[PDB]
Design a protein around this nucleic acid. Structure first.
Lengths: 38, 231, 83, 360, 72
RNA sequence: CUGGGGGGAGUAUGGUCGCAAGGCUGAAACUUAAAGGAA
């Protein structure tokens, strides 16, 4: 049968590891999307 | 035992012993320029002398005198020689940032190991004749696999200059003494530093390992000679 | 009490050209200072589960089951290994 | 019911020709008088590759492993992957797929994963530059062996994407009643996980042997850097001689191992190539099997191909005996009518083959 | 002679080659490298090997048919 | 010192042929020197 929407993603150790090394790349290159004070 | 070969700064080689007096014989004009490194074969009857006249030479022992028979002239000032501990390879370190591994039985030019980026000091061949070390003034020693000439590690030691590097007798562990008053004990499998020995005060010019058992002596610029044993 | 950041800087000053000591120390502080991949209950008289690891093995199991069924789906032969 | 063969010789050719002909075979006594008797793992994984490629074919290995029953089925192809064992490289499994490759429902897009080269097997450059042009002029037009990464032995770790995408009906009838004039001689010297000077040493050795013939020598050079290099050090050299007016080619390859001089290997492969040119006439000694297989599964006409005296051997005539054992056809060796050499012209009347799997 | 030897299938293939004068191994049999070196030090042995539409289709098929007859 | 496609101004492009991105260099088979760059 066909199904309407994709289910909510299960958060496993692989996706936490991928997300953490994304954060590590951004945080060692200081690629921060902060607000800048006018 | 009881017999010493030696080469000097100028074009001279010399032979001494233990029971009798100094000179068995000297060979004036053993080389045109500064000799830099010699090595016996494991049976001892045939030795190799590489010198800064851009030549290496081979010598045999005729009966207790030296027989020059062949000479390989290179394009560049050879400054280290070594043979394998099973008469198999002749690895020679040139001033042109490289080493060359030859076959002793053919002068075959097996390999050229390259990429050290300064002139390159002491070599060592392992007991299985599979793994070589390569020290230089680039403050790092390189481990090479001799079957295909492929590098394994390029580990950065020794912040001045590694003067000498020597294996243990039966293992793939090795020692390297350097120009910044430190000897260092490594393994050839995990490539850790096993120990960081800190007894000298100045430039450690040489070290020598026992043939069996494995206690190592190191001798330096502060006129000191010191022994290192097991615990 | 004291911050996880303060305890993390203290753990780095605690642990401090060897490599495997750094591999061991980094893996130790990662699996120590990651508390959201364990689950802890409260003892009424404590790490009681490993949610992300259990999830990834439970979904890799059915992933290889699904690929095996997709490989089986329109086959008609098969080797008969009687060895 | 079953055509019976004995012994584990020509095993891939027997299973391949049984798949082409659609005839149930038995292969009996697979090394039965031996210490570890039976089928080996690389030929068992070749059977698994046959089950991947076809559909509805039942293979039935015995208890002892020394006899196999192949009742073939429809070649369907599809996209697949094959994790072949360390006992044989990817060439051992992509060589017998080049016969079954243009005769399936869906086009062959397989990627093999394992060791790339071996001393006693086909390489990537061997398969490509030698064995693809003979198919390219036997009728297929879109065939490609891609290397995504390559792995020298013993650890390997190299993947090879075989893609054929011309699904022909039957191969055309060959007519090569000439010896093709060699226009150029090219090659490829490859090395993985070693220094880039070994490739130039191999090239210089091969070309210093080749320098006295008055043709043009060109050897391309590839070192493999990065993850594309695989898990082991290795290096090798493959030369081809190229007839450009028709497209024919004659190849020779080898690989070096622990203790091998690259100038030695280059001059060895160069002299082995020149001997293949000597003992060759319009095919190679290794391009000859699938050449006469495509001639025997062509149309129901006469196709003739020139061969020389030295290409006849026990391998060639055991090939011919297996061909006649499966689908009952003979080759007719008529000699040429000029006598400065000994060349036969093998005429084969092809069986009435079509591929009946491709949907119309 | 050679075709009768090939398809006379009660004699071994090496016996066919012997009285005229294995495929898992892909690359063919070569000599020793030393014999091949002394054989191919010379080069001159192989220096001479070195150096309307409807009616068109009908002509191709009649060419194949006359090839069929003159080789039958 | 004879040879000629078809207007002007533009727009789009899942077609074909090209040219072009990455990402500190040295530096890869080596997590490797000096020096340089950047901030």
């Amino acid at each position: 049968f066909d199904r309407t929407a994709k289910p909510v993603p299960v958060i496993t150790s692989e996706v936490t590891e991928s997300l953490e090394d994304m954060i590590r790349r951004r945080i060692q290159d200081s690629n921060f999307d902060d607000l800048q004070r006018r | 035992g009881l017999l010493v070969i030696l080469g000097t700064r100028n074009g001279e080689l010399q032979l001494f012993d233990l029971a009798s007096s100094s000179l068995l014989d000297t060979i004036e004009d053993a080389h045109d320029a500064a000799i830099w490194s010699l090595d016996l074969t494991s049976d001892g009857k045939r030795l190799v002398t590489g010198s800064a006249d851009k030549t290496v030479k081979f010598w045999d022992f005729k009966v207790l005198k030296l027989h020059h028979d062949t000479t390989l002239e290179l394009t560049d000032d050879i400054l280290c020689v070594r043979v394998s501990p099973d008469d198999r390879y002749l690895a020679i370190s040139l001033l042109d940032n490289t080493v060359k591994v030859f076959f002793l039985d053919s002068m075959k030019f097996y390999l050229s190991l390259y990429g050290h980026k300064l002139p390159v000091l002491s070599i060592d061949i392992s007991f299985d004749s599979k793994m070589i070390i390569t020290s230089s003034a680039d403050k790092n020693i390189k481990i090479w696999g001799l079957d295909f000439g492929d590098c394994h590690k390029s580990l950065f030691a020794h912040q001045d200059s590694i003067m000498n590097v020597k294996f243990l007798p039966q293992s793939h562990n090795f020692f390297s003494c350097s120009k910044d008053a430190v000897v260092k004990y490594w393994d050839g499998e995990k490539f850790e530093c096993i120990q960081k020995l800190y007894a000298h005060q100045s430039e450690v010019w040489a070290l020598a390992v026992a043939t069996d058992g494995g206690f190592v002596v190191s001798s330096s610029h502060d006129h000191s000679i010191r022994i290192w044993e097991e615990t | 009490a004291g911050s996880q950041l303060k305890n993390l800087k203290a753990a780095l000053k605690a642990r401090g050209y060897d490599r495997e000591e750094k591999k061991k120390a980094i893996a130790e502080i990662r699996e120590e200072f990651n508390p959201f991949e364990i689950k802890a209950a409260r003892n009424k008289r404590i790490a009681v589960g490993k949610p992300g690891i259990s999830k990834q093995i439970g979904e890799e199991q059915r992933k290889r089951a699904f690929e095996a069924r997709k490989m089986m789906k329109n086959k008609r032969g098969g080797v008969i290994d009687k060895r | 019911k079953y055509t019976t063969f004995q012994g584990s010789q020509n095993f891939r050719l027997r299973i391949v020709l049984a798949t082409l002909s659609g005839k149930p075979i038995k292969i009996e006594k697979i090394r039965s008088g031996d210490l570890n008797p039976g089928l080996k793992d690389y030929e068992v994984s070749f059977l698994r590759l046959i089950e991947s490629v076809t559909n509805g074919s039942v293979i039935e290995i015995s208890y002892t492993g020394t006899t196999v029953i192949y009742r073939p089925g429809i070649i369907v192809g599809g996209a697949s992957t094959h994790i072949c064992p360390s006992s044989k490289p990817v060439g051992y499994f992509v060589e017998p797929m080049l016969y079954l490759a243009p005769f399936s429902k869906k086009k062959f897009s397989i990627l093999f994963k394992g060791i790339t080269a071996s001393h006693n097997d086909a390489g990537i450059e061997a398969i490509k530059w030698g064995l693809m042009p003979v198919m390219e002029k036997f009728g297929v037009r879109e065939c490609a062996l891609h290397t995504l990464k390559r792995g020298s032995p013993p650890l390997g770790g190299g993947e090879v994407h075989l893609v054929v995408d011309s699904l022909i009906a039957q191969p055309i009838t060959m007519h090569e009643i000439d010896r093709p004039i060699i226009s150029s001689i090219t090659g490829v010297a490859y090395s993985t996980r070693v220094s880039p000077s070994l490739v130039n040493r191999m090239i210089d050795g091969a070309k210093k042997v080749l320098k006295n013939l008055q043709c043009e020598v060109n050897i391309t050079a590839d070192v493999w850097r990065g993850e594309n290099s695989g898990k082991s050090p290795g290096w090798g050299i493959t030369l081809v001689a190229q007839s450009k007016q028709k497209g024919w080619s004659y190849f020779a390859e080898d690989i070096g191992d622990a203790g091998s001089i690259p100038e030695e290997l280059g001059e060895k492969v160069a002299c082995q190539l020149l001997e293949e040119i000597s003992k060759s006439a319009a095919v190679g000694r290794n391009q000859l099997p699938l050449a006469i297989v495509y001639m025997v599964i062509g149309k129901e006409d006469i196709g003739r191909l020139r061969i020389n005296k030295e290409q006849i051997d026990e391998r060639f005539i055991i090939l011919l005996r297996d061909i006649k054992k499966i689908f009952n056809t003979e080759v007719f060796l008529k000699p040429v009518d000029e006598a400065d050499n000994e060349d036969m012209i093998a005429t084969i009347k092809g069986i009435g083959f079509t591929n009946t799997s491709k949907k119309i | 002679n050679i075709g009768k030897l090939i398809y006379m299938d009660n004699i071994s293939p090496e016996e066919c080659i012997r009285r005229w004068r294995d495929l898992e191994k892909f690359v063919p049999y070569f000599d020793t490298f030393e014999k091949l070196a002394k054989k191919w030090k010379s080069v001159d042995a192989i220096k001479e090997r070195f150096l309307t539409w409807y009616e068109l289709q009908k002509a191709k098929i009649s060419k194949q048919l006359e090839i069929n007859n003159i080789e039958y």
